Design a protein around this ligand. Sequence first.
Ligand SMILES: N#CC[C@]1(n2cc(C(N)=O)c(NC(=O)C3CC3)n2)CCN(Cc2ccc(-c3ccccc3)cc2)C[C@H]1F
Ligand SMILES: N#CC[C@]1(n2cc(C(N)=O)c(NC(=O)C3CC3)n2)CCN(Cc2ccc(-c3ccccc3)cc2)C[C@H]1F
Lengths: 281, 286
Amino acid sequence: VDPTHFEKRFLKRIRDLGEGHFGKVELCRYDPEGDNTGEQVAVKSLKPHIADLKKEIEILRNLYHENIVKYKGICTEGIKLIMEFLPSGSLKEYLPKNKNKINLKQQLKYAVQICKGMDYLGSRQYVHRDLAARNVLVESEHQVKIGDFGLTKAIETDKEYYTVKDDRDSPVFWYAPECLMQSKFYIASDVWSFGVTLHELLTYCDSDSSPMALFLKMIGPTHGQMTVTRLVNTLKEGKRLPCPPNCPDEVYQLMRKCWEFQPSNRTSFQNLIEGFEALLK
Amino acid sequence: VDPTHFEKRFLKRIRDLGEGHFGKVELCRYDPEGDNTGEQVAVKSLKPESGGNHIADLKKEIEILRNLYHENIVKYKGICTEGIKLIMEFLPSGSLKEYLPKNKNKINLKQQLKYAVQICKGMDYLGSRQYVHRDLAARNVLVESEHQVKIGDFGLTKAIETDKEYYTVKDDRDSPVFWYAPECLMQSKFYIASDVWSFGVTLHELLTYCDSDSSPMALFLKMIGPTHGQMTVTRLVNTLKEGKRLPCPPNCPDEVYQLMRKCWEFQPSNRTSFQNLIEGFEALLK
Ligand SMILES: N#CC[C@]1(n2cc(C(N)=O)c(NC(=O)C3CC3)n2)CCN(Cc2ccc(-c3ccccc3)cc2)C[C@H]1F
Ligand SMILES: N#CC[C@]1(n2cc(C(N)=O)c(NC(=O)C3CC3)n2)CCN(Cc2ccc(-c3ccccc3)cc2)C[C@H]1F
């Protein structure tokens, strides 16, 4: 028996956790004993792309970090990715419900954990391209994990970026200028996405203060197919998301270094970890 | 009796000529005698909707066209008030988009260059009156006769303020991005030289007899990708930055293609003028 092989006949659907256009993530029970005592797992599968999900599987099987969601295995007929289930869900779900428990100190410790997960990923020569609050899972009050790698790409040795073609469905309000303007993704482009994710965490992921809501207030909600060129315009003019309410100026200044127009300027994840760790002393 | 006053009770709707998000142009017969001998007219009006004010903009459109008089600009006839309507002459040949694909055998390069000249004289007259058109495309160039075209729609036209070089726009929902200059796509600024860039695209259309498989949209999408959705425009700006342009139309002589390329200099300041284009074409026609 291979402990990473899940047989389809024992993988019982409970409900949907999420979807995109091409597939979904379901809560299942792997129940070989047929008595409802089996472990709960999160199962990623395609709608009736296959190559890309195989690639995603091979990336996560080989990532080992306490701030990256655990790979458990595969179900093969078509293929399914089996992951650990984190019943608290994402920061987008958990923060609005737990404001009274989660103070600034705990927000700064989630930020450090996200930076350590991201720095580990970058050390393996990967660019995530989708870092947002909806992709950061809560293991417990004290610990978060990056929970999805559906857009993750390898940077070739000697090169600094990966160029993307499949850019329909881009999370434009989290993207660095070089990503919007030229579809180039650097480690520095995840640093920019981390700054937006930090902004979300410090707003307790409220909908009315989302990066999208706030950017649309800046450029206009009408606009349509001109939305991204107007966004690049306002980033060009030097404008950024505003300081979250109640956020100390020195936390805001670490955030702002994620958002230097030029990738080569921007802070590293290691510098961010040292900046936050200084504020927690 | 005001001859520019059309009474609703005599304005008989025939069919739709065109539609936009907020309004339409319709073929009507103005038939006061009630025996179907009255004149056919093209009638611009708003869909019942309206709001962010379509009505104010349509009344501005009417005041712009009422006061334009040029043989290469469609004729104002009047208004109908009831939700106002803009009454214009009807040109049964329609736009270059309808007429050229049906008349390839009759319209040779000499006739194409004469049409180019007549659009440029129309446009030069509009720029002389301090207006920026912002929608110059073959679908907006009407055919009077095999020998004469007229600019037939002014729905986006704007006044450049005195002492100013451009107009900046805010409602850019529904922009004809494949006809737009870099300064238009990047910063929603519209110069006289922006209408020169749109003219170049319009010339390309005329030289391809408006075939749909050779349209500016069809050919740009083949360069950048028919995919892309919301990223289409930033990919287009990228393509233009890198110096790529619509290719020479089949059978187009290089000397005509060179006049078209001077329309498409990246900086507005480096583009040819309408009076330069007229001179260029007239040199080729001698
Ligand atoms: N991260 C995170 C968030 C997700 N998550 C994961 C868990 C978990 N492991 O416990 C979870 N836990 C809950 O919610 C607990 C409160 C109940 N949530 C995982 C992502 N999906 C979105 C999505 C869906 C499909 C595809 C896809 C599939 C195939 C091809 C191409 C794309 C991409 C992304 C959303 C969430 F399911
Ligand atoms: N030019 C030109 C082309 C048009 N045209 C005009 C004629 C004509 N005069 O004979 C015509 N003649 C034919 O076709 C002859 C073959 C049968 N065609 C005029 C433009 N519309 C498009 C359109 C429609 C509404 C609005 C609008 C309205 C209100 C608010 C906001 C927008 C904007 C643009 C398309 C054509 F009707």
